[PDB]
Design a binder for this molecule. Structure first.
Ligand SMILES: CCCCCCCCCCCCO[C@@H]1O[C@H](CO)[C@@H](O[C@H]2O[C@H](CO)[C@@H](O)[C@H](O)[C@H]2O)[C@H](O)[C@H]1O
Ligand SMILES: CCCCCCCCCCCCO[C@@H]1O[C@H](CO)[C@@H](O[C@H]2O[C@H](CO)[C@@H](O)[C@H](O)[C@H]2O)[C@H](O)[C@H]1O
Ligand SMILES: CCCCCCCCCCCCO[C@@H]1O[C@H](CO)[C@@H](O[C@H]2O[C@H](CO)[C@@H](O)[C@H](O)[C@H]2O)[C@H](O)[C@H]1O
Lengths: 36, 189, 75, 87, 40, 75
C-alpha cells in the first residue's frame, strides 16, 4: 500500500490506545452529575 | 495461439482502490442526510464540516490536490468557523427551530422523483460511466511530458493573463463583501 | 460489580414477602417514607438542562426582546 | 451520480424547513458544493483546467455570500433577538 | 381518419392533471401549521 | 335585467368575484422565507414538468384556470 495510508492508520491506532489505557485502567465512577 | 490480450496486476507502480470512492460517496450522503434532519444548528454545521471533508478527500483521491486542499483551507478552515462563531453566540432555543417534519415526507417523495428523473438525463456520459464492464486504458507520452506542471501551476499560467478579467471581477466581489459587511454591522467610531 | 450475576438474576423472580411476626418501623416510633416523595431530590443532580431544552417562547416575551439590543456594535 | 444526490440534499433542506433560517443558509452551500463538484469531475474527464478555475471562482463567491449572509443575519438578530420564524 | 380510444386517453388526462394536483396537496400538508401527519 | 342579471353577469359580478379571488391569493403572501422558498421550488418543478413531458398546452390552461377557481372559493 501507499505510505500516507499506513501513516494515518498508525497514528489512529496510537490515538485509540491512549483511550484504552484510560478506559481500561482509570477508575470510572458512574455518577456523572439560562441568560441572555 | 494463446490469448493475444494479456491482463496482469501491477506490483509497485499501482494506484488506489476505486473502492474508496464508493465509501466516500456513502459517508458524504450519510453526512448530508444528517445536516438537514439534525435538530440543533450547531450539529448541522458539524455534519457540514464532515461533508466538506469527504468531498475534499474524494477530490484528492482522484488527483485534484490543489482544489481539494483549497476546499479544506476555505470551507472547513474559514467559512464553517464563521458559522460556528455566529451559532455559538446567537441565542438559539432548539425547539423554536423544530417543525413538523413528518408532514413533508410526501412532498419529499414527490420532489425527489421529479428532480432525479429529469436532471440525471442532463449529465454527460463520462460522469455516469460508473457482466462485461468497460475498462479505461492509459499509455505514456514523451513530447507532452517534457516539463509537466502541477494543476496549480497550470491554473497560474492562465489565471493572471488570458482569463485575468475573471480575477478583476472576483477582486471586486471580495472588496464589496468587505465594505458592505463592515458597514451593516459596526457602529462607526 | 457488573450489576448482573447468576444469583442476582434469580433474585429478580422473587417478590418481597413481609414477615407478619416481625416488628416494623412503627414499633420504633418511626414512619417510613415512600420513594415518590424523594425522586426529585436524589435525581436533580442528573438533570441535563441548558438553554437549548427550554420551551418555545410566547408572544408577550418576544415583544420584551424588542426593548433590548442583542448585539454590541461598538465592541 | 454523487453530485446529483448532494444537490437533492440541498433541495430537501428547503423542503423540510419551516423554522430554520440557518438551514436555509446551510442548504444553499450544499447546493454550491454539488455544482462545483460536478464541474470538477467533468473537468478531469475532458483534461480541461478551465473547469478547475471555474470551481475556484465559485468557491470564492460562495465564501463572500457567507460573509454577506452572516453579516445580514447579524444585523437582523441585533434588533430581533431571535432567528426563529413564528408559525 | 384514425379513430382513437377515448377511455385510454381520458385516463391519461386524469393521471396527468390529477398527478399535478397531488403535488399541490403535498404543498398543503407540508405547509400545515399543526402535526397533521403524512397520510393527511 | 338592468339592475339584475346584467349587473350580476357583468360589472357587479366581476367586482364581487375578483375581490374575493385576490384576497385569497394575497392570503398566500406571509413574509415567511421558509414558505417562499417552497413556492419557488414548486414553481420550478411545474416548469420542468411542462417543458420536458411535452405536455399539451391545453393541459396547462386547465390547471391555471382550475387554480383560479379554487382561489375564488373561500375556506
Ligand atoms: C474502543 C475499544 C473497545 C473498548 C476498550 C475499553 C473498554 C472499557 C470498558 C472496560 C473497563 C471498564 O472500566 C470499569 O468500568 C466499571 C463500570 O463502569 C467501573 O466500575 C465502577 O462502577 C460500577 C458501576 O456499576 C460499580 O459497580 C463498580 O464497583 C465500580 O468499580 C470501573 O471503575 C471501571 O474501571
Ligand atoms: C362587460 C363588463 C363591464 C366591463 C368593466 C366594467 C367595470 C366597472 C366596475 C367598477 C366597480 C366600481 O368600482 C368601485 O365602486 C365603488 C362604489 O361602488 C367605489 O367606492 C367608492 O364609492 C363608495 C360609495 O359608498 C364610497 O365608500 C367611496 O366614495 C368609495 O369607496 C370604488 O372607488 C370603486 O373602486
Ligand atoms: C348582455 C350580456 C352582457 C355581458 C357582459 C359581460 C359579462 C362578463 C362575464 C363575466 C361576468 C361575471 O359573471 C359573474 O361571475 C361572478 C363571480 O365572479 C358570479 O358572482 C357570484 O356567483 C355566485 C352566484 O352565481 C355567488 O354565490 C358568488 O358569491 C358570486 O361570486 C356571478 O354569478 C356571475 O354571473
Amino acid at each position: 500500500m501507499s505510505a500516507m495510508s499506513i501513516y494515518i492508520i498508525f497514528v489512529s491506532i496510537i490515538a485509540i490506545l491512549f483511550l484504552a489505557i484510560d478506559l481500561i485502567f482509570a477508575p470510572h465512577n458512574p455518577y456523572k452529575e439560562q441568560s441572555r | 495461439s494463446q490469448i493475444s490480450l494479456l491482463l496482469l496486476k501491477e506490483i509497485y507502480t499501482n494506484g488506489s482502490t476505486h473502492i474508496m470512492l464508493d465509501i466516500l460517496s456513502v459517508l458524504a450522503v450519510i453526512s448530508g442526510i444528517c445536516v438537514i434532519i439534525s435538530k440543533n444548528p450547531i450539529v448541522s454545521v458539524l455534519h457540514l464540516i464532515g461533508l466538506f471533508a469527504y468531498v475534499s478527500f474524494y477530490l484528492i483521491l482522484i488527483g485534484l490536490n490543489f482544489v481539494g486542499l483549497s476546499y479544506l483551507i476555505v470551507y472547513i478552515g474559514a467559512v464553517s468557523i464563521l458559522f460556528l462563531f455566529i451559532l455559538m453566540l446567537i441565542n438559539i432555543r432548539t425547539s423554536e427551530l423544530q417543525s413538523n417534519t413528518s408532514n413533508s415526507i410526501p412532498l419529499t417523495i414527490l420532489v425527489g422523483i421529479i428532480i432525479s428523473s429529469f436532471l440525471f438525463k442532463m449529465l454527460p456520459y463520462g460522469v455516469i460511466i460508473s457482466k462485461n464492464d468497460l475498462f479505461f486504458i492509459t499509455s505514456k507520452i514523451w513530447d507532452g511530458a517534457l516539463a509537466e506542471n502541477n494543476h496549480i501551476s497550470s491554473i497560474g499560467n492562465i489565471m493572471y493573463t488570458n482569463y485575468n478579467v475573471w480575477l478583476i471581477l472576483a477582486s471586486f466581489i471580495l472588496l464589496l463583501a468587505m465594505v458592505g459587511a463592515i458597514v451593516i454591522t459596526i457602529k462607526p467610531r | 460489580d457488573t450489576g448482573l450475576s447468576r444469583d442476582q438474576v434469580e433474585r429478580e423472580f422473587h417478590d418481597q414477602v413481609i414477615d407478619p411476626t416481625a416488628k416494623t418501623f412503627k414499633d420504633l416510633g418511626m414512619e417510613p417514607t415512600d420513594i415518590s416523595k424523594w425522586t426529585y431530590h436524589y435525581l436533580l443532580p442528573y438533570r441535563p438542562s441548558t438553554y437549548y431544552d427550554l420551551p418555545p417562547s410566547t408572544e408577550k416575551e418576544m415583544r420584551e426582546e424588542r426593548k433590548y439590543l442583542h448585539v454590541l456594535d461598538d465592541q | 451520480n454523487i453530485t446529483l444526490i448532494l444537490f437533492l440534499i440541498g433541495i430537501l433542506g428547503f423542503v423540510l424547513n419551516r423554522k430554520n433560517i440557518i438551514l436555509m443558509l446551510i442548504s444553499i452551500e450544499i447546493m454550491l458544493l454539488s455544482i462545483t463538484f460536478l464541474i470538477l469531475l467533468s473537468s478531469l474527464n475532458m483534461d480541461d483546467i478551465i473547469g478547475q478555475t471555474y470551481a475556484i471562482y465559485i468557491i470564492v463567491v460562495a465564501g463572500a455570500e457567507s460573509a454577506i449572509g452572516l453579516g445580514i443575519l447579524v444585523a437582523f438578530y441585533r434588533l430581533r433577538g431571535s432567528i426563529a420564524i413564528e408559525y | 381518419y384514425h379513430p382513437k380510444d377515448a377511455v385510454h386517453l381520458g385516463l391519461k388526462g386524469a393521471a396527468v392533471v390529477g398527478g399535478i394536483g397531488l403535488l399541490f396537496a403535498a404543498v398543503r400538508t407540508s405547509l400545515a401549521r399543526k402535526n397533521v401527519g403524512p397520510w393527511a | 335585467l338592468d339592475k339584475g342579471s346584467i349587473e350580476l353577469f357583468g360589472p357587479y359580478g366581476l367586482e364581487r368575484g375578483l375581490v374575493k379571488l385576490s384576497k385569497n391569493i394575497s392570503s398566500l403572501s406571509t413574509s415567511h422565507v421558509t414558505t417562499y422558498a417552497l413556492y419557488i421550488l414548486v414553481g420550478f418543478i411545474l416548469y420542468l414538468i411542462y417543458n420536458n413531458l411535452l405536455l399539451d398546452y391545453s393541459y396547462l390552461l386547465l390547471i391555471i384556470i382550475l387554480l383560479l377557481l379554487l382561489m375564488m372559493i373561500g375556506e
